[PDB]
């Protein structure tokens, strides 16, 4: 709860409502994100998902599909991810249950 993740809006001239990661706050080549409400994803319960920061960038800009290794381990699985109205990242399970993503503590 100590943390959420507020994606910063980027303007300019583009077709989509583009989004941006925090400038240097998050610069980890592959960063892991915990979830406020742990979910049942791919027949297992997951408390954290690690992303390649590079892959999360282009998805925040161009959209499309985004994979992420559940609980940091195994294969990079496809994810039902969306940018929230509160500017958060929300993952959904097969019940469409949402969960906010947070960046780990110091």
């Amino acid at each position: 709860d100590k943390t959420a993740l507020t994606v910063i809006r980027l303007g300019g001239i583009f077709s989509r409502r583009q989004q941006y990661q925090l400038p240097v706050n998050v610069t980890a080549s592959t960063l892991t994100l915990l979830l406020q409400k742990p979910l049942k994803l791919h027949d297992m319960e997951v408390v954290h998902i690690s992303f390649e920061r590079s892959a999360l960038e282009q998805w925040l800009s161009k959209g499309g599909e985004i994979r992420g290794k559940l609980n940091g381990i195994g294969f990079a699985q496809k994810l039902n991810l969306e940018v929230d109205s509160a500017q958060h990242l929300v993952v959904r399970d097969v019940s469409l249950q949402g969960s906010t993503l947070a960046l780990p503590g110091s």
Binding site: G11, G12, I13, F14, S15
Partner: protein, 710 residues
């Protein structure tokens, strides 16, 4: 909008008297009633008159005879149906979508029915009118801003001035009041793309099959520079059609870019042919990058699609083949491609996105009907919206005209839907009719006549393919299933050249036919040495077609009588009475034709444009020198071995001959020979002078050109 048709006597007072009462009540409500003589007259009135805005009829007498026929013409047209005993809701009607109000014939109902019809008509009017223009009219009616500018205050100052009254008196209050500023804040904002301005963009973007559409009010000249400056970084190489517009030269002078040119083909007539398939292929481009001094891989290409004479590219092939990230189709000639299936696979916007590329069309709306300077930028792919929008805002007029913007929006309103589809269909049908009419008059008359430059038979309604196995087009080794002839662009041929491109002994240069038509106010769209073009637009009616058709037979009649120039061309006569006193029209033709024949003009013109002057420096490089005022004039005769400062643009044939930074050498001597030849051939007849832009005729009759100082 106040004409109501009534169609009937019924033979019973209980029906006839209410219609009398309604006639009178409606006339008092300011409707003009009109009475078609019969059912067919009514359909012709509707077909030809958009001001007929309602039809009253007996339901039983006419519904099965009229309803579908009217719905085919206009599905919003108010119908007021009067019932009899058997009138009701038959299950057969349940499935039709119709706009129907049911009314009874009754005295005293007109006041209330008229008010409902008025309201229902306003509802229909409000649906069809575009919202920005609608809001503008409402302001002109209701608003009360006084103590305001513009200083003319709704044209008020014009009325107290006879000189200003001439301008006001013609245009009037409404025209004067529609010249508004952002003080009328409730129309939204162009610069924010908000309110009724967004609604317009979506409307257009959806209509024209674009991802995004911008409204430009300074022509495609400006649309090119907005796209250009965003698209062509400094130090980069661009592929550019040597067949380019001047505004792209002005861009090159302003941006540090290196051009490599797509090289069109050309035939003996001088008609441009398409860049062959080889010019798009990676191997070909790579080879020119190797051969061009300081060239890198191109960042931006600009192709003119279609060509003027109707050769369209297989754009599916180009989008798949051309390995350039940014492709701009200057599609000024083909604004209508979305509206005929015959253009599928042959236009920029056809189909979906092209993965990995941004594709542009810039279009000159003004082969459609719109005010001059109206141009669109149609984008298929993404731009950096903030940098693109900053680029747009930097090149926006100082004071946008609020009509021009509405004229482009109202031009679409006119062409919209069925009725605009049926209008263009009608013009295609008449095009083919006229084509066969020329063939008829060719048969009927003894001796020479006009011919049409087209296939032997046109049994098919389409853009006819030009094939390598056909000789009619005069192009050499043409690609097949590549170019198509637009039916509505009709080229006529005058006597003077053979089907070979070889010269006849007898010729009538087309310029002389133009002088004749000019005395009679008839303009020829486009003329070349022996060709004339006519466009069959939605303007062109039976009266104009007859006047043109008759004017053409009158030219022949008058030519063959060998009328005195004095009598046939009185305005030309007045220019030099003595020069023209005894000359007859056939002698004028002979002398000019003999000059053309002798000076072998077509061969010399062909050869001048088949080689390229040597690029010593780029246009931009030469402009740096000009920027410091380092230019002198030399005479035309002295230009071999000198670096040209200006573009030299001769007429004919109306395309650039020498660029700034280019130099005539021995390799390109035919250039100078053509130029000197033009000065000679054109020095003979008053009214038939030489015309070369960039060369300055000194008061002594010698020509100078601007060159770089040493």
């Amino acid at each position: 909008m106040n004409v109501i048709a009534i169609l009937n006597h019924m033979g019973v007072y209980f029906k006839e008297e209410p219609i009398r009462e309604l006639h009178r009540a409606l006339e008092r409500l300011n409707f003009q009633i009109v009475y078609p003589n019969d059912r067919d007259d009514l359909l012709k009135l509707i077909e030809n008159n958009a001001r007929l805005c309602g039809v009253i009829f007996d339901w039983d007498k006419y519904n099965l005879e009229l309803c579908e026929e009217i719905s085919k013409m206009n599905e919003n047209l108010p119908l007021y149906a009067f019932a009899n005993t058997y009138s009701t809701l038959d299950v057969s009607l349940n499935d039709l979508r119709l706009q129907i109000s049911f009314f009874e014939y009754a005295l005293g109902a007109a006041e209330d029915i008229a008010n409902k019809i008025k309201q229902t008509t306003d509802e229909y009017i409000n649906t069809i009118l575009p919202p920005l223009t609608k809001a503008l009219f409402k302001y002109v009616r209701e608003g009360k801003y006084t103590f305001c500018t513009p200083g003319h205050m709704g044209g008020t100052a014009f009325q107290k001035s006879p000189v200003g009254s001439l301008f006001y008196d013609f245009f009037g209050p409404n025209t004067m009041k529609s010249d508004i500023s952002i003080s009328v804040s409730e129309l939204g904002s162009l610069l924010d793309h908000s309110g009724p301005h967004k609604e317009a963009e979506q409307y257009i973007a959806r209509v024209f099959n674009a991802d995004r559409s911008y409204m430009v009010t300074n022509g495609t000249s400006t649309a090119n520079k907005i796209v250009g400056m965003y698209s062509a970084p400094a130090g980069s190489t661009i592929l550019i059609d040597r067949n380019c517009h001047k505004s792209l030269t002005h861009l090159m002078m302003m941006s540090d870019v290196t051009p490599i040119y797509f090289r069109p083909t050309r035939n003996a007539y001088g008609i441009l042919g398409g860049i062959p398939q080889s010019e798009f292929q990676h191997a070909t481009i790579a080879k020119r990058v190797k051969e061009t001094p300081n060239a890198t891989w191109p960042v931006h290409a600009v192709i003119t699609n279609s060509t003027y004479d109707g050769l369209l590219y297989n754009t599916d092939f180009i989008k798949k083949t051309l390995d350039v990230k940014s492709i701009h189709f200057d599609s000024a000639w083909v604004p209508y491609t979305n509206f005929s299936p015959i253009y599928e696979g042959k236009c920029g916007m056809s189909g979906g996105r092209v993965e990995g590329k941004v594709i542009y069309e810039t279009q000159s709306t003004h082969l459609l009907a719109a005010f001059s300077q109206a141009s669109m930028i149609h984008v298929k792919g993404d731009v950096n919206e903030e940098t693109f929008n900053e680029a747009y805002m930097m090149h926006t007029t100082t004071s946008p005209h609020y009509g021009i913007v509405a004229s482009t929006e109202t031009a679409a309103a006119m062409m919209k839907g069925n009725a605009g589809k049926r209008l263009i269909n009608g013009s295609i049908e008449r095009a083919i009719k006229f084509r066969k009419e020329i063939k008829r008059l060719r048969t009927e008359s003894d001796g020479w006549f006009f011919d049409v430059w087209q296939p032997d038979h046109i049994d098919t309604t389409e853009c006819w393919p030009l094939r390598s196995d056909s000789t009619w087009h005069g192009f050499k080794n043409i690609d097949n299933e590549h170019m198509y002839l637009d039916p509505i662009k009709v080229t006529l041929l005058t006597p003077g050249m053979e089907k070979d491109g070889t010269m006849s002994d007898f010729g009538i240069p087309a310029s002389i036919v133009a002088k004749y038509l000019d005395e009679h106010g008839i303009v020829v769209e486009k003329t070349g040495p022996y060709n004339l073009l006519f466009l069959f637009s939605i303007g062109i009616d039976k009266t104009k077609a007859l006047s043109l058709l008759r004017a053409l037979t009158d030219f022949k009649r008058a030519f063959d009588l060998n009328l005195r120039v004095k009598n046939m061309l009185p305005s030309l006569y007045r220019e030099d009475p003595e020069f023209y006193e005894n000359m007859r029209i056939q002698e004028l033709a002979q002398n000019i034709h003999k000059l053309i024949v002798h000076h072998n003009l077509p061969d010399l013109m062909y050869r001048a444009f088949e080689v390229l002057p040597t690029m010593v420096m780029t246009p931009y490089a030469a402009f740096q020198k000009e920027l410091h005022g380092m230019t002198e004039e030399v005479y035309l005769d002295e230009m071999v071995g000198r670096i040209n400062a200006n573009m030299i643009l001769p007429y004919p044939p109306g395309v650039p001959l020498v660029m700034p930074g280019e130099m005539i050498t021995e390799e390109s001597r035919p250039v100078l020979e053509f130029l000197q030849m033009l000065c000679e051939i054109g020095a003979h007849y008053p009214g038939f002078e030489t015309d070369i832009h960039g060369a300055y005729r000194q008061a002594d009759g010698r020509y100078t050109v601007k060159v770089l100082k040493e």
